[PDB]
């Protein structure tokens, strides 16, 4: 007789990292709102990471980001249009630079979301990492207003936490947006406001940088009569409170006993 309850041949079964699951969940949410996902380089130049985004040398703002500087000969960093871009190299402290790289190479209107790994020089603890992930969006076009920004984040809240979810915006400062704001979502099941990220209307000086640089490369300017908004958020923060991960250090810890738990999550 054949025992049907006997274990069958042991083929392997895979799984995806908590962060990939979460990242995927956020990209599809925005895809439904017409946003396309584009990625950028991890090793950036100070120009795209700081200068173009209105964050200059010896300025209080520069203190908000703890940069890892890089040294290395014979490394080719190439700009938006495949040109050799010259600057002091660094590991990106945010995904924002990619938004300048996109604008110089494309013409408005458009809506983009750029997920990515970012680095900050910090002491890694249960809620702090030096290597983590962010997701930033950018919508540029004639007539884009703050109302449209509040609308997008509203749709984000509704999608992550339900119809009974509500967003809240308050003023905050960022060198690359004005007005600027921080947004929080009412997580109804947790009965508390969660601070998710920042956002604001692209700063006049960011568009000038884009065009000025476009002109340098021979491209006609495209950001003269447009407005636009941008927001950015941390992925780990969501991933933790959504999957219930207590220690941010698990993400890069590579323990199979941790990762395997997320096999069932699609």
């Amino acid at each position: 007789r054949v025992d049907v309850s006997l274990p069958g041949a042991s083929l392997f079964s895979g799984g995806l990292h908590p962060i990939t699951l979460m990242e995927r969940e956020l990209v599809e949410i925005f895809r439904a709102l017409g946003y396309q996902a584009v990625e950028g380089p991890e090793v950036e130049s100070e120009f795209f990471n700081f200068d173009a985004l209105n964050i200059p040398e010896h300025h209080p703002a520069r203190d908000m980001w703890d940069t890892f500087w890089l040294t290395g000969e014979g490394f080719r960093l190439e700009g938006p249009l495949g040109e050799e871009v010259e600057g002091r190299l660094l590991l990106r402290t945010h995904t924002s630079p990619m938004q300048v790289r996109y604008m110089v190479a494309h013409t408005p209107p458009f809506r983009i979301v750029v997920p990515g790994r970012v680095f900050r020089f910090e002491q890694t603890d249960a809620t702090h990492e030096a290597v983590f992930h962010q997701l930033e969006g950018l919508v540029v076009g004639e007539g884009i207003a703050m109302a449209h920004l509040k609308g997008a984040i509203y749709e984000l809240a509704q999608a992550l936490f339900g119809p009974d979810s509500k967003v809240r915006f308050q003023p905050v400062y960022f060198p690359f947006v004005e007005p600027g704001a921080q947004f929080a979502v009412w997580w109804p099941e947790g009965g508390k406001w969660l601070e998710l990220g920042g956002a604001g209307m692209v700063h006049p000086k960011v568009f000038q940088a884009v065009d000025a640089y476009r002109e340098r490369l021979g491209l006609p300017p495209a950001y003269r009569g447009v407005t636009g908004f941008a927001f950015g958020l941390g992925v780990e923060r969501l991933a933790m409170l959504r999957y219930g991960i207590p220690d941010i250090r698990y993400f890069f810890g590579g323990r199979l006993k941790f990762l395997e738990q997320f096999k069932g999550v699609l």
Binding site: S5, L6, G8, A9, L11, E155, A159, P246, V265
Partner: protein
């Protein structure tokens, strides 16, 4: 509908060309399937007058003496060759399109035939080949070439949708083109009537199936062949000319989508009676078929004293007896509106489809009857020199169309356009509507022939098609969806990931028809189908599938015969019907299996399929288990039920050998489940940062005892600190007490907050050992490092 170019051009005199006309009609909503060119008549074909026709003794042939400029003679066996008519003579030397051969002078029964008189078919102007073309004796000067009176024509084959029955008449199409700006030349009814009584009467016995009926009176008729212009027009229209009067009725029908029929008074009697057919009443319709009328067939009947006889099938086909022929001198002209539904059923019933029924089903201008009478009568007078009575007999009084409220603002609001008020109302007016009011909401009343214009939307489409759909701008909407629509796609998404996970593992997707052979319910041993078709494509497709697997199994065989696969692993997700419609998932494994190609050792069959399934289930993050149970279609020795998250959702096993044998298949393993599978949320369990404790143990169990039962026991007893439990060896033989087997297990105990004391593991492995023996099991080994 064949729309002959030169004919339509008689109403819309300014048409640019057929190519442009086609483009014009496309935008108005009518698509042409093709554009044919049609009357290539050779110069060798001339017009000849038949002076006399002499029969050739002992033959059925006749010797026609023709005035064809010069007097020639032609032999012909046509049932209608007779003196006093015009014929199309093909002079010797003429290459004919129709008969594809060369015409020559030839000897036929003692007479030398100079060419040959032609039939509609031989000339290539029509399919009919049972007789000579008959033209009026004086249509043309004997000898003058036909081409000169019969030029080529371009004919457009239009698609005319159900909403526009008025387009089943050339004037109808003409009025649309008119709204675009073309000039409309409507024909005038030149009548010279005379006040005198109608020699018959009308009795409408069913005003429900004939809401408007009218009869006209024409007498002093001289029936003859139609003018060349009317013959050319009819042939192009796909119709064959008969004679003077019948042709007028076909010409006016096409002209205005109003079928009509002339009855020879001789057969009418005292009058026409529109009534239902009586049981068993018969009628020999024009087609020659003697039919048997059904009590629901509307009939045009004539009566005499107290007798009522069927004259024709109302609005479908006329009787062959009263048909207008040569000796007919006076007729009664039928022109009416019948109920679509009634005509429809009768038409289907008798397997008839005529130009008449076709237009009556779609509908006819409820008030176009009278005007049609004047037109046909007028032509009869002109063509057959008829004397026409002034009065018409009319039954019915249809109410004119009702007014529709029109808001130009709303038109624009719905289209997203901004056509100015004035410009919109002028469109409506060009189309024939009467617009009342000063705005903003007008009272627009549609023409009687536009049966499709009833609502305001109908009117906004008119503004759109005349302005052009091209003029509607592009745009995208922006809005927050109403709350209940949120999350509405979770299901679709869940099933689509399932398919993706399946193809990822290695399963190949298959699509199979929803239909099932009822006999299969037998071959496979299943309950019979619950839904069967009343009109199946075939007997083997006469039912709706109750299971998915039968089909997979068949495509498997079909593959083996066509190509000889060494293996296959398929899967299908699809609807299944039984009590309720439900979605199923099913797969099948067959063939050699997995292993090194250049080696013989292979993984295959039941435990391989069960592997792909356990693998599949870990990815979906669900608990999967197989308990043995019998299934009619499965193999008794390899048959079990699938338990997902603790519930029975389907089976898994080897195909029953007998079914295998009957179908000539090798063994096959398969499974079938009912989707959607349970959904299990994420409960994160922070893993212990402290070392596990290992231990090995074997259980001696009587051969029949299921591995699953043992596993459950060791597990339930191992305690809250058991982390992993695995089977590494299955043995049964010496010196194991015969009729027994041993199950080797690698166990792992782990304490979350701290490391375990040996006494904890020990004491714990004792709870297992205890309950293990209390069930009657022995311990072949335990506490092995």
């Amino acid at each position: 509908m064949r729309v002959p170019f030169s004919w339509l051009k008689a109403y819309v005199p300014e048409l640019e060309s057929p190519e442009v006309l086609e483009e014009r009609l496309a935008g108005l909503g009518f698509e042409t399937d093709r554009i044919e060119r049609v009357f290539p008549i050779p110069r060798g074909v001339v017009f000849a007058r038949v002076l006399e026709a002499h029969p050739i003794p002992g033959t059925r042939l006749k010797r026609l003496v023709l005035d064809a400029g010069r007097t020639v003679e032609v032999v012909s066996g046509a049932e209608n060759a007779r003196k006093g008519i015009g014929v199309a003579l093909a002079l010797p030397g003429t290459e004919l399109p129709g008969l594809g051969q060369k015409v020559g002078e030839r000897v036929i029964q003692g007479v030398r035939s100079f060419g040959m008189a032609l039939s509609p078919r031989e000339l290539g102007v029509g399919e009919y080949g049972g007789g000579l073309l008959e033209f009026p004796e004086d249509a043309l000067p004997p000898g003058t070439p036909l081409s000169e009176a019969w030029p080529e024509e371009v004919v457009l084959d239009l698609e005319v949708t159900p909403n526009r029955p008025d387009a089943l008449g050339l004037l109808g199409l003409a009025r649309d083109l008119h709204a675009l700006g073309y000039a409309l030349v409507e024909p005038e009814a030149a009548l010279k009537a005379e006040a005198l009584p109608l020699p018959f009467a009308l009795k409408v016995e069913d005003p429900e199936g004939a809401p408007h009926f009218t009869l006209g009176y024409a007498f002093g008729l001289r029936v003859a062949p139609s003018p060349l212009w009317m013959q050319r027009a009819l042939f192009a229209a796909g119709m064959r000319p008969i004679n003077n009067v019948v042709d007028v009725t076909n010409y006016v029908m096409l002209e205005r989508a109003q079928p009509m029929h002339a009855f020879d008074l001789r057969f009418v009697g005292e009058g026409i009676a529109v009534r239902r057919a009586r049981e068993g009443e018969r009628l020999k319709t024009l087609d020659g078929v003697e039919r048997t009328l059904h009590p629901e067939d509307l009939v045009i009947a004539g009566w005499r004293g107290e007798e009522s006889f069927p004259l024709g099938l109302a609005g479908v086909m006329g009787g062959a007896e009263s048909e207008v022929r040569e000796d007919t001198e006076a007729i009664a002209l039928e022109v009416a509106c019948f109920d679509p539904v009634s005509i429809r059923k009768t038409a289907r019933r008798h397997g008839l489809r005529t130009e008449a029924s076709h237009r009556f089903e779609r509908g006819v201008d409820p008030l176009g009857q009278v005007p049609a009478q004047r037109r046909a009568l007028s032509l009869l007078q002109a063509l057959a020199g008829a004397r026409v009575a002034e009065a018409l007999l009319e039954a019915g009084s249809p109410k004119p169309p009702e007014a529709i409220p029109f808001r130009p603002e709303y038109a624009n609001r719905l289209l997203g356009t901004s056509y100015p008020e004035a410009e919109q109302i002028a469109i409506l007016k060009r189309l024939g509507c009467r617009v009342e009011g000063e705005g903003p909401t007008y009272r627009v009343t549609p023409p009687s022939h536009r049966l499709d214009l009833r609502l305001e939307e109908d009117l906004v489409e008119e503004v759109a098609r005349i302005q052009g759909y091209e003029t509607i701008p592009l745009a995208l909407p922006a809005f927050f969806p109403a709350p209940d629509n949120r999350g509405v796609e979770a299901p679709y998404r869940k099933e689509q990931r399932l398919r993706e996970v399946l193809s990822g593992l290695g399963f190949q997707e298959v699509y199979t028809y929803s239909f099932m052979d009822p006999e299969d319910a037998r071959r496979f041993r299943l309950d019979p189908p619950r839904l069967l078709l009343l009109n199946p494509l075939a007997p083997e497709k006469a039912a709706l599938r109750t299971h998915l697997f039968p089909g997979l199994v068949r495509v498997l065989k079909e593959n083996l015969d066509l190509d000889r696969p060494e293996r296959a692993l398929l899967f299908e997700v699809g609807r299944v019907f039984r009590e309720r419609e439900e979605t199923h998932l099913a797969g099948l494994l067959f063939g050699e299996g997995v292993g090194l190609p250049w080696a013989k050792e292979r993984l295959s069959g039941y435990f391989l399929l069960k592997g792909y399934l356990e693998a599949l289930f870990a990815r979906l993050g669900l608990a999967f288990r197989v308990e043995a149970q019998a299934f009619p279609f499965l193999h008794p020795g390899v048959s079990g039920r699938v338990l997902v998250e603790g519930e029975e959702v389907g089976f898994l096993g080897a195909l029953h050998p007998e079914i295998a044998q009957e179908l000539e298949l090798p063994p096959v393993h398969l499974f079938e489940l009912r989707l959607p599978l349970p959904d299990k949320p994420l409960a994160f369990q922070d893993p212990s940062r402290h070392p596990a404790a290992f231990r090995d143990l074997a259980v001696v169990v009587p051969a029949p005892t299921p591995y699953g039962e043992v596993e459950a026991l060791v597990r339930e007893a191992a305690g809250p600190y058991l982390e992993s439990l695995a089977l590494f060896d299955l043995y049964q033989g010496p010196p194991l007490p015969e009729g027994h087997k041993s199950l080797a297990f690698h166990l792992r105990f782990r304490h979350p907050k701290r490391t375990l004391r040996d006494e904890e593991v020990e004491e714990a492995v004792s709870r297992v050992a205890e309950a293990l023996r209390a069930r009657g099991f022995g311990l072949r080994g335990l506490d092995t490092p």
